[PDB]
Each structure stands twice: as structure tokens, then as C-alpha cells.
Ligand binder design. Structure first.
Ligand SMILES: Nc1nc2c(ncn2[C@@H]2O[C@H](COP(=O)(O)OP(=O)(O)OP(=O)(O)O)[C@@H](O)[C@H]2O)c(=O)[nH]1
Ligand SMILES: Nc1nc2c(ncn2[C@@H]2O[C@H](COP(=O)(O)OP(=O)(O)OP(=O)(O)O)[C@@H](O)[C@H]2O)c(=O)[nH]1
Ligand SMILES: Nc1nc2c(ncn2[C@@H]2O[C@H](COP(=O)(O)OP(=O)(O)O)[C@@H](O)[C@H]2O)c(=O)[nH]1
Ligand SMILES: [Mg+2]
Ligand SMILES: [Mg+2]
Lengths: 53, 439, 426, 439
């Protein structure tokens, strides 16, 4: 009975940690897509100014 | 002969233990460095202190104790202090970071890292005993290491030793004065998982002691040093029976048989009398009858509760010093006669009495008067049911909005455990209600 | 054992952080040259919470200094104790932020942050038990909020289980220091609320009032205001360094202080504070410390706590004290002023006591409150943001770096949700 | 560390620059020959003057500046004068013939002959910087060379550097006082082609200065020397932040972030206080609160306009010398309270504050009192919209009869350019009307 209670607690904890890692990876991917989008928008504005001159 | 192992867990555990070991050394004449100026016999015999100290070397007395914490600060205070030479280095065990009052941090995430070390030390010490009777565990209920680790330790000891008694000395959450805002969660969880593994838990309360110190010793500023010395005196009277000859000796085993009428009701409250400063002791006659009656007043309980609202199920009196059995018996008969003290109908013989010849010891620099005789009382009453009810109420108010719940869930404690522990406590409240109904 | 990495950023952050290190060196007996010249063993037992030990028995602050303009750092190095920070931890760019959050977060900071992180990794590798990070910064500026949240996010991804604490200077209620504060502050809060464990809110408007009203300084300077901030920062971690009757570290404070994961903005305070001339007329007792701590006029946040309720309060005391007095005075406060605390949390006060007072005092205490009154700060920022956003005033400066309206809109919505969540519990 | 390049164009540009370089030398202790009596460190360090002077030879300090004119006379006065040994020969650039107040000669016919020389020199100087922040260009609006050449230069720099800030200090045509009969043509043409290339242009006015000199300094004959010294003090306060430590530092980039709410509105007006002669200063109390209030007085504007006719969009207060942050904060709150000072509804946070420790310097032989503290204010207001309207009116009256038009057409300008420039100015007036409307 003791080992079984302890093993269930271990399994819950590990699943929790896997979900946390997934959320952290999603946050990272959202920031990288956002930053890259910002760089592209900035690049395009600058090229248009050069075309204008 | 007979041996007893002391385990001190967490901040409160270690600080009380320091008060206890100073007192044991004074009573036996053992110096802080483990030497004895009158060490005439080395390695055994009686020398009754062999109950608590191991005999080694060529006159070194080593206390049978283990001090455990998840954080190093309190233990380091021991390691560099006065008694640094008294304890073996492996009796002082530390982790790196505390549980932060998170039950789950202590029980599920951190404690697993040192529990095997702690158990191995207990094993090595236990193997040197021939007459081990039990363990004494010192802890607090609302604490992180305190309850997290104690619960973990209790389960493991139940498996490995099984039959040795396990007595717990602990600090119950006070009704008004608190030190954390999460205590209701920690206390409910502790009882749920530890209740079935303990044989008898003795309760004390800091709030009640604060008032005793103020009224009886006239201490307007009763800090932890003073509280720890009063707790130490109670513990000493309980174990004095093993160490000193008495008229009626009581071992550790007889306490759980006399004070626990049902397996789920094992929480006697402790008291002690006289508590008096020297200035007043000089003018009073601290007779057997007077001390005995003092122990039953609502004004001298070490637990803030009110005994007049419950009934006594069992009552254990321990006398020390200049005590005569006929005076003791007469005092008890008076108490049985007095109508304000009620006993349950199913317990016609509620009293059990031990008497020891050795009078109490005053620690130099202490508050207490030197007296010829003192009485320690342990009582199991239904009055305590109210304290449990207050605690359950506080739990419900916070759980209802899930305040702070994510702090336990994030450590691996499945949310449903909170509900199961609550249901169990409801059952405990009901068990008290039933034994309290006369029929 | 437990170690703290200290990161300072932007002009404000470096001014406060430099004062912080001066205060710690005095507490531990550390000379401006790094040599130890103290008088108690307790100064060395936990010296490594904040310092690395260099050969020759010298101590080096485990601190990192970050900026986009080198002028700030030259001031740090030339002043008192400027010589104790190692040169390898001065990490900086050349361009400055221009008070443009977008530049601080997406361009200039975007390039500098890799160097900062490499320094952070070298420092965390030297720890036996890293416990957490402390970041010092402002919210209404460029480098401060740009690098502030850029670093917080990167660190949270790499060290998801360490403690992340910040001390932030917030926009004042009457006088702005920067014309576009509402944009910088809204964008910053949006990210802080997701990544940190606790934030202390510091308002110069409140600090000017305290040093003028209580300490009677008619000519306070930033050095004096920085002193008050430093005293609080030091008080928070006292128990990691010194022994006492009942301890609490950073992890314990977070557990007791935050009932719900998003409500972690605190209003700090400090006691005793007296003017020099009046020092001679008031005895300091525990009841006196309690009286000054629970005082609307002694809060360092510019938000009146009497307009809301306390979810929780921490009181950390330093010096020899009666435990009974500490417990009793806290009980008396909750019982007599019950209208200011939430009824769903039995016991709203957590305490700790360390045995060593700040140098020069017999005793002192630090107050940390978690009050729903804080919604006023967030509400003010939201309304100012709205007024400017609606006419896109000064907005082309952010969109010119590649930010857009969608980013601004999301930050606005989160600001408003945080306010609703605080209101929900009053 | 951080560097700044100064460009001085035409008659007004060069003469103001001379006033500035004398003041910079006095503040740093640099002699007219580039030597320093206390030249203890050579080639770098701080020596904060390294922002404006490069370190060459073995102790010579060389200003980072370029002086450009089409007319050889003003530069020759520099070349044979006191500071002839301070500037590098290639920093003094001249043509052979002036623009003769013809915009087109300055822009299309003559300016093209030296623009490549000027740009190459700017490039060589820029390449020696490691932290160039921007350029400061000094010019006049109604000037032939001033605006013809500046417009040409601005276009070329915005292509080659792009991201460096470009700040302009310029003299706005006065409403009554004028020197040329064609200023309305030159000013409209300048704004049309330069508006899009400048980040922020600070306005001053000779007519307004003459009144200040007469009222505050009691000067009945305020010749250009005096005007140039007052202008120099404003420029110095703006750049002092880079050169001296402050309580709150402000770089050059921060000015455009705080003062320009929309890309087409970037003409803050400058003021300065206190302006006082020594004789009155002896009796005055030049407190922080008084100096601050003085900056909002209609009688102390450096631009002849009336601030009570518009609203403020953004105000930047630069304090120098003995200034306490608390007093600055209190003084601002007072200004916001006064109902006579209006701000646009869309700008709830209209102020920016910088504080520097270094007090202002008085040039020996000057008019100004030595003071402990001074304030420079830069502010963007809608009041200026009226000045633009007056200028457009004058243009229309002359264009209607084609007065002097053939002088521009004969240089290669098309008639269409006059019409287009006028249409754009109509748009600029409308832009101010919209920001001025609360909703
Ligand atoms: N009687 C008495 N009680 C104490 C003493 N020190 C602490 N306590 C009690 O201990 C309780 C809290 O539990 P702790 O023992 O501090 O818990 P811990 O072992 O440090 O583990 P953490 O909670 O994670 O820090 C409080 O309610 C205090 O009243 C003491 O010296 N004497
Ligand atoms: N404040 C100030 N203004 C000056 C000074 N010298 C000339 N000006 C102004 O300059 C304006 C005319 O433009 P300038 O720069 O002088 O002439 P330019 O650059 O040689 O070009 P041309 O028009 O072709 O002669 C006039 O309206 C004067 O008010 C001076 O020393 N100080
Ligand atoms: N308390 C305090 N605040 C400061 C100090 N220096 C600057 N500040 C504040 O910093 C804010 C401006 O942003 P800042 O951090 O200086 O610009 P940044 O370098 O781009 O981040 C204002 O709200 C100032 O009041 C200081 O020494 N002490
Ligand atoms: Mg602990
Ligand atoms: Mg000319």
C-alpha cells in the first residue's frame, strides 16, 4: 500500500513537469516568431525609404 | 538496560532539543565536552543515564539523538556553539534549502533526498541498543520541514521497527497567534497522513505558555528561550521515570496503553505545576494536595482550550521529589469528589499514578524556583474536539477559494488530497462526539 | 549556501544598485578595496550569499551591470566602492535607448542581451545552491523596461525553478519624468506579470514625501532616496545571512505572500524613521515599530492602503526582541482594524525575527504589504495609456521599429484584467 | 564614447558657431591654440570634452566641426582671427560667390559645386567617431545660402547616414523685422523640401531677443554679438548633458522621442532663464521655483509669438547647477495647477526633466550675471501655428503678382515648385488644427 501511494504521487508530479516544459517551449516560440516579425517589418520600412530617396 | 532515541526535526524541533540536552547534562553531571568530573565507571552499568547517553572512549558520554533539518542555519548554531563537542557530527543532518512552509515541498520534493540518510543513522543508533523502548519525535504542526518531513519519517519507521513505541511532542497551532498564513493547510494534511502511525502525541501551545509565563512567573516578555525551558521540564518529568528510581515506576509503553481508549483518539494535553518564581516560592507551601489541585485549573493548561466544556477520558499523574503515596491518594480522592470535574461514564477508573524520588532541577540562569516536589499531568479529554473544529473551519474558508492551492499542486501533490484529508478530519471530529455521549 | 545573483540595469538601476552594494559592504565589514576588516565571525559565515571569494581573502560582489550607454558605468566606477565590481561584468552597448521601449526590447537590447546572458551563466556556474536573482530597474524608461523584461524572460526560460524578484520604480501620480511613460509602463507590466515571482513597487513621489515629512530633509537628493530603497532591499534577505529566532527566506515569503499567482505586486515600507533632531525624544519599542509600519503615510508606494484591503502582510524584524511582543502587537492590529483585511484568510500576517539589527540601530523592521489598493496604480496607467493611444500620439516612434497596434492592444487588455482581478477580492 | 558633429552654414551659421566655440573652450580650459595648461592625460579618458574635441598630436584639442559658406568673407575672418589656430584648415570651406538671397542659387546652381567637398569632410570626421549620436546644423530660414545649401545637405546626409539624429538650430523670420524683401519665398521653399528630413528643429528669433536684451539686460543697443552669446548659452545647456555628469542625464536621441508627437510637427521653441545683469542679480533670489515659472512667461519667449493662443504638447526642462530634484518636482506641479497654462487632452504627461550638476559659464566681457542655477526649456506648442499662417499670407501676396519669380526660374526652378510648396504649407497648417482639437 505505501509504495503504491508514493508511485502515484511521483507519476502526477512528472506529468505536471512535462506540461510545464511544454508551456515554456510555447512561450519561447511565440517570442521568437514575434521578434522575427518585428525584424521583417523594420527591414521593409527601411527599404521603402531608400526607394523613395 | 533500557534505551530511548530522541529525534529533533525542523526549527522548533532543534531549538527544543537544545533546551532538553542542557537539562539532561545538568542532571547527570555531564559537562558540555562530554566529560564527567566523577566518571568512576566507564562503558555501562547504572549510571542510569545510559538510557540517554552512550558510553564510549575513555569517559565520553554521547547523547542518543538525531537532529534533522532541510536548512543549515539552526544546525550550524549547534555545530559552532557550547555543545558542539557533545554531539557526533553525523547526528547533525542538513539539507540546502527549506520547505518554505509548503507541506508538499517537505514531504514530496525535498525530504526524499535526505530521508535515507536519516533512516540509516537511526538504524545505526538503534542497533547499539539492547532494550530500545521507543522514539521521541519533536516537531511543529504548521511548519514545512516539521510536518512534511515528520510524516515521511513516521511512515518509514512504522515499516522498519513496527512495534517500538512512537511518541510525539508537538506544537499545536494557537487559536489567535499564528506565524504563517498557510497553517490550516499544513495542519490538516499532517493529521491526515500521520494519525495512523503515531501511538501518542502530546500537545503544547505557544499562546498558552505566553500566558502562563506572564501570570505565574511574572514574565512580561516570555521569549522562546523561556518557552523552551518550560517544555524541557515537562519532557524531563516524563523520562525521569526511566532514569531515576521511584516508588512507582512508569515506562514508555504504559503511557500509550493508559491514555488511548480508541485508536483514533490519542492526543493528551500536557500540564505542569507548580510554576512559580523564587520570590513567590519563598512564601508558599507547595504541598502535595495543592500542586495536585492546581493541575486541574483551566488557568494552567499548556494548550489554549477550555477543559470545562469536555470530559476526561483518561488522566496520568507523574509526581517527583518529596512525595508520600498517602497524600497523593487523598488529593486524588478530593478531585474525584469535586463536581466541576467530569469524567466519561464509561471510564470509572480514570487515574493512573507514577511517583519518582528525584526532585526537579533548576537550570542556572533560569526563571523557576527550586522546589521539593512537582507534578506533571497528561490528560486526554474531549474538550480538544473544539480545537479540531476551529482548525477545520479555517481550512474550509481558504480552500473554498483555493487560496494558495497552486503552491502545493506545483510540487506534485494532486489536488484531490486536500479533499480527502478534509473528509478524514470530519470523521475525527465525529469520533470525539460519539465517545462523549453518555449511555 | 543559497546564492543570489544581482543584475542592475539602466541609469536608475545602476544608481540604486550602487547604493545597495555600499550598504552590504558596511554590514559585513568589507573595505572599498575588497579586504575584510570586520569584528565578528557572523560576518563571514554567510558572506557568500552575495560575494565570491577571490584569492588573497578578498570579496567580489556577485553582481552584473547592464546598460546601452557607457556614461552610466563610468559614474559607477569612479564613485565610492566603484572599484569593487569586477570589470568583466560591465556589459554595455553604445547607442542608448532614447526612452523608446521598442528599441530597448527589439533592437539594441536584442543585440546586447546575449553578452549579458553569457555573464549570467558564468556566475550561476559558481554557485553551490543558486536560489535566485534580484533585478533592479525602472518601468517608465527605455533601457530599464527594454532590458528589464528581455532579461527576465530569458532567465525564466533557462532557470524555471529559481526565484525571480524585482525592485521596480513606477510612474508617479502628479509629475512625469518622461513624456511617453504610459506606453513604456503598459508594455512592461504586460510581461512582468507573466514572468516574475514578486515585484516591489517604489515611487519617488512617495519617497520624497517620506524624507520630507518624517526625516525633515528639506534638500533630499537621489543619494538619500536611494538609501531608503537600499535599506528595504537589504532587509528582505536578512535571514539568508544572519541567525535568529524564527527565519524566513525569499521562498517562504513568496509562499505566504501570494494567494493567487498573478497578485504579486507589493508595497514595501521601513521603520523606524525619525529625523535626527527628534531622535533623542522617542524610545524605540516593539509597539513603536508596529505603529510606524502600519501607517499609510509611511508607505514607499504611492498608493493609499486605506482604500483597499490586505490579502497578506509580512513583517520582518531585526534585533533582540520578545517574541511575545511581536506576536501580540500583530494580533492587536488585525483585531482592531478588521475592516482592512480580507475575511477569507484567517491570519493575515506573517512574521520573522533575525537577531542582528542594521548597523547603528538597536532594532528595526521591514514591512511588505499585498494590498488590493494597488489597483489604483494600474488604473492610472491604463487611463493615461488610453488617452494617448486613441490619438496615436508619439506612436510612430514604436511602430517605426516594427511594433504594431496588435501588440499595444494586448498589453492594454492585460492591464485591465489585472485591475479587475484585484477588484474581485474587495 | 559618445560624439557629436557641429555644422555651421552661411553667415548666421558661422557667426553663431564662433560664439559656441569660444564658450566650449572656456568651460573646458582649452586655449585658443588648442593647448591645455593642465593637459595631464593625452588621447582619451574623461576629459568629457572628447565629445566635442578630438585628441591629436601631443596635447592638441581639435573641435569636431565644419564651417561652410559660398561666400569667402565670413570664413576669412575666422581664418585670420583669434581661433585661427584652433580649427583644421579643411574645416573651413569656402566657395567663390554667394547665393545672393536666391534659394535656387544656393540649392541648384552654386551649392552643387561644393556639396561633394562638404560631404567628404563630414565623412572623414564621422569615421573617427565610435559613438556618433547625430549632427547639429546651424542655419537661418530666410537666407539664400542658409536654406539653399542646408536643404541640399540635409538630403544627402539622410541618405548616407540615415539613422543618426539630425537636429537643427535656426532663426525663424521675425514678424516685423526683416533683412531681405524675399524672405517669404525662401522660407516657404525651405520648409517644403526639408521638413521630411529633419528630426527636430529648434526655433529662435532675433526680434524676440532684442526685446529680452532691452528688458532683462537693460541693453539699448543689442547688436549681433549679444544675440550670439545668448544663443550660445542655449546650445550649451542642451549639449551640457553629454559633457557633464548630472543627476538625470539626457542624450540627444531623447529629445525627438519626447518632443515630436507626430512626424510633421517638430518645431519646439526655445527659452532660457534667468536672464539677468549682474546689477540686478545681486538683489535677486534665483530659486528653482522662480526660474521655472519664468520659463512660462510670454515676455520671455525667444520666438515672437503668444503662447496664450495655443496649447502645449510637450515640455522639456533642462536644469543646471545647484538643483535639488524635490524642488524641481514641486515647481512642475505648480505649473500644472495654473489654469492659464493649457495642455492638449491627449497628453496627460507633458513633461520631461533632466538635471545637470555643472552650473552655467559666463564669458569674460559678457552681459550675464554669474548664477548658481539656470533652466533651459524646449517646448512644442500649437501657438506656433499662427506664425506659419502669417508666413503663408506674405507668400501669397507676393506670388499673386509673381514678384521676383523670374529670379528663381532663371536658375532652373520650375514655376510649379512654388505652387507645390504652397500647397504643402496649407497642409501643415491643417495638421496643427487637428492636434489642437480636444475630443
Ligand atoms: N515553543 C517554541 N516554538 C517555536 C520555536 N521556534 C519556532 N517555533 C514554532 O515553529 C512553528 C513553525 O514551524 P518551523 O519549525 O519553523 O518550520 P521549519 O522546520 O523551519 O520548516 P519551514 O516552515 O519550511 O521553515 C511556528 O508556529 C513557531 O511558533 C521555539 O524556539 N520554541
Ligand atoms: N542671430 C543672428 N542672426 C544673424 C547674424 N547674422 C545674420 N543673421 C540673420 O541671417 C539672415 C539672412 O541669412 P544669412 O545667413 O545672413 O545670409 P547668407 O548665409 O550669406 O546667404 P545670402 O542670403 O545669400 O547672403 C538675416 O535675416 C539675419 O537676421 C548673427 O550674427 N546673429
Ligand atoms: N529613485 C531613483 N530614481 C531615478 C534615479 N535616476 C533616475 N531615476 C528615475 O528613472 C526614470 C527614467 O528612466 P531611466 O531609467 O533613467 O532611463 P533609461 O536609462 O533609459 O532606463 C525616472 O522616472 C526617474 O525618476 C535615482 O538615482 N534614484
Ligand atoms: Mg526551517
Ligand atoms: Mg553670405
Amino acid at each position: 500500500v505505501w509504495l503504491e501511494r508514493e508511485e502515484r504521487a511521483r507519476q502526477h508530479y512528472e506529468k505536471h513537469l512535462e506540461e510545464r516544459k511544454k508551456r515554456l517551449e510555447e512561450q519561447r516560440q511565440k517570442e521568437e516568431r514575434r521578434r522575427a516579425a518585428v525584424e521583417e517589418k523594420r527591414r521593409q520600412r527601411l527599404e521603402e525609404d531608400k526607394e523613395r530617396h | 538496560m533500557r534505551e530511548c532515541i530522541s529525534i529533533h526535526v525542523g526549527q522548533a524541533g532543534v531549538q527544543i532539543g537544545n533546551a532538553c540536552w542542557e537539562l539532561y547534562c545538568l542532571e547527570h553531571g555531564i559537562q558540555p565536552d562530554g566529560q564527567m568530573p566523577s566518571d568512576k565507571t566507564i562503558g555501562g552499568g547504572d549510571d542510569s543515564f545510559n538510557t540517554f547517553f552512550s558510553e564510549t572512549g575513555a569517559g565520553k558520554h554521547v547523547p542518543r539523538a538525531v537532529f534533522v533539518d532541510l536548512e543549515p542555519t539552526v544546525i550550524d548554531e549547534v555545530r559552532t556553539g557550547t555543545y558542539r563537542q557533545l554531539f557526533h557530527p553525523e547526528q547533525l543532518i542538513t539539507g540546502k534549502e527549506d520547505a518554505a512552509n509548503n507541506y508538499a515541498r517537505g514531504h514530496y520534493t525535498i525530504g526524499k533526498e535526505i530521508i535515507d540518510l536519516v533512516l540509516d543513522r537511526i538504524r545505526k543508533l538503534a542497533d547499539q541498543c539492547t532494550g530500545l523502548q521507543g522514539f521521541l519525535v519533536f516537531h511543529s504542526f504548521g511548519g514545512g520541514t516539521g510536518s512534511g518531513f515528520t510524516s515521511l519519517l513516521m511512515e518509514r519507521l512504522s515499516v522498519d521497527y513496527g512495534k517500538k513505541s512512537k511518541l510525539e511532542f508537538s506544537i499545536y497551532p494557537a487559536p489567535q497567534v499564528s506565524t504563517a498564513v498557510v497553517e490550516p493547510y499544513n495542519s490538516i494534511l499532517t493529521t491526515h497522513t500521520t494519525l495512523e502511525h503515531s501511538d501518542c502525541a502530546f500537545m503544547v501551545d505557544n499562546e498558552a505558555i505566553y500566558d502562563i509565563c506572564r501570570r505565574n512567573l511574572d514574565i512580561e516578555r516570555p521569549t522562546y528561550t523561556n518557552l523552551n525551558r518550560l517544555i524541557s521540564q515537562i519532557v524531563s518529568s516524563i523520562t525521569a521515570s526511566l532514569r531515576f528510581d521511584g516508588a512507582l515506576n512508569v515506562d514508555l509503553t504504559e503511557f500509550q496503553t493508559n491514555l488511548v481508549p480508541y485508536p483514533r483518539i490519542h492526543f493528551p494535553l500536557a500540564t505542569y505545576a507548580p510554576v512559580i518564581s523564587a520570590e513567590k516560592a519563598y512564601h508558599e507551601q507547595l504541598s502535595v494536595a495543592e500542586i495536585t489541585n492546581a493541575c486541574f485549573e483551566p488557568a494552567n493548561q499548556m494548550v489554549k482550550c477550555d477543559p470545562r466544556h469536555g470530559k476526561y477520558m483518561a488522566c496520568c499523574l507523574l509526581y517527583r521529589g518529596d512525595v508520600v503515596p498517602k497524600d497523593v491518594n487523598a488529593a486524588i480522592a478530593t478531585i474525584k469528589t469535586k463536581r466541576s470535574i467530569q469524567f466519561v461514564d464509561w471510564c470509572p477508573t480514570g487515574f493512573k499514578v507514577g511517583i519518582n524520588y528525584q526532585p526537579p532541577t533548576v537550570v542556572p540562569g533560569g526563571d523557576l524556583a527550586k522546589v521539593q516536589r512537582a507534578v506533571c499531568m497528561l490528560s486526554n479529554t474531549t474538550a480538544i474536539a473544539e480545537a479540531w473544529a476551529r482548525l477545520d473551519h479555517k481550512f474550509d474558508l481558504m480552500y473554498a477559494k483555493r487560496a494558495f492551492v497552486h503552491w502545493y499542486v506545483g510540487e506534485g501533490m494532486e489536488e484531490g488530497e486536500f479533499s480527502e484529508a478534509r473528509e478524514d478530519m470530519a470523521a475525527l471530529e465525529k469520533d470525539y462526539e460519539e465517545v462523549g455521549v453518555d449511555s | 549556501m543559497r546564492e543570489i545573483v544581482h543584475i542592475q540595469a539602466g541609469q536608475c538601476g545602476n544608481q540604486i544598485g550602487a547604493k545597495f552594494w555600499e550598504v552590504i559592504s558596511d554590514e559585513h565589514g568589507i573595505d572599498p578595496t575588497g579586504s575584510y576588516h570586520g569584528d565578528s565571525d557572523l560576518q563571514l559565515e554567510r558572506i557568500n550569499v552575495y560575494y565570491n571569494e577571490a584569492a588573497g581573502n578578498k570579496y567580489v560582489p556577485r553582481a552584473i551591470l547592464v546598460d546601452l550607454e557607457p556614461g552610466t558605468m563610468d559614474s559607477v566606477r569612479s564613485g565610492p566602492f566603484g572599484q569593487i565590481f569586477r570589470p568583466d561584468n560591465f556589459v554595455f552597448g553604445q547607442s542608448g535607448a532614447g526612452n523608446n521601449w521598442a528599441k530597448g526590447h527589439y533592437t539594441e537590447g536584442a543585440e546586447l542581451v546575449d553578452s549579458v546572458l553569457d555573464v549570467v551563466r558564468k556566475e550561476s556556474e559558481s554557485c553551490d545552491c543558486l536560489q535566485g536573482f534580484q533585478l533592479t530597474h525602472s518601468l517608465g524608461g527605455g533601457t530599464g523596461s527594454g532590458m528589464g523584461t528581455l532579461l527576465i524572460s530569458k532567465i525564466r526560460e533557462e532557470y524555471p525553478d529559481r526565484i525571480m524578484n524585482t525592485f521596480s520604480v513606477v510612474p508617479s501620480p502628479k509629475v512625469s519624468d518622461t513624456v511617453v511613460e504610459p506606453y513604456n509602463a503598459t508594455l512592461s507590466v504586460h510581461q512582468l506579470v507573466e514572468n516574475t515571482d514578486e515585484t516591489y513597487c517604489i515611487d519617488n513621489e512617495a519617497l520624497y514625501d517620506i524624507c520630507f515629512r518624517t526625516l525633515k530633509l528639506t534638500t533630499p537628493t537621489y543619494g538619500d532616496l536611494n538609501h531608503l530603497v537600499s535599506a528595504t532591499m537589504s532587509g528582505v534577505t536578512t535571514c539568508l545571512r544572519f541567525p535568529g529566532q524564527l527565519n524566513a527566506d525569499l521562498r517562504k515569503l513568496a509562499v505566504n505572500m501570494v494567494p493567487f499567482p498573478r497578485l504579486h505586486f507589493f508595497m514595501p515600507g521601513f521603520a523606524p524613521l525619525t529625523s535626527r533632531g527628534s531622535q533623542q525624544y522617542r524610545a524605540l519599542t516593539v509597539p513603536e515599530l508596529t505603529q510606524q509600519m502600519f501607517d499609510a503615510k509611511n508607505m514607499m508606494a504611492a498608493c493609499d492602503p486605506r482604500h483597499g484591503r490586505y490579502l497578506t502582510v509580512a513583517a520582518v524584524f531585526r534585533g533582540r526582541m520578545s517574541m511575545k511582543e511581536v506576536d501580540e502587537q500583530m494580533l492587536n492590529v488585525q483585531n482592531k482594524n478588521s475592516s482592512y483585511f480580507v475575511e477569507w484568510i484567517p491570519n493575515n500576517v506573517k512574521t520573522a525575527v533575525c537577531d542582528i539589527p542594521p548597523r547603528g540601530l538597536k532594532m528595526s523592521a521591514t514591512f511588505i504589504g499585498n494590498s488590493t489598493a494597488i489597483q489604483e496604480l494600474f488604473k492610472r496607467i491604463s487611463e493615461q495609456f488610453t488617452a494617448m493611444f486613441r490619438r496615436k500620439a508619439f506612436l510612430h516612434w514604436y511602430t517605426g521599429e516594427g511594433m504594431d497596434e496588435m501588440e499595444f492592444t494586448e498589453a492594454e487588455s492585460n492591464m485591465n484584467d489585472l485591475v479587475s482581478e484585484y477588484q474581485q477580492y474587495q
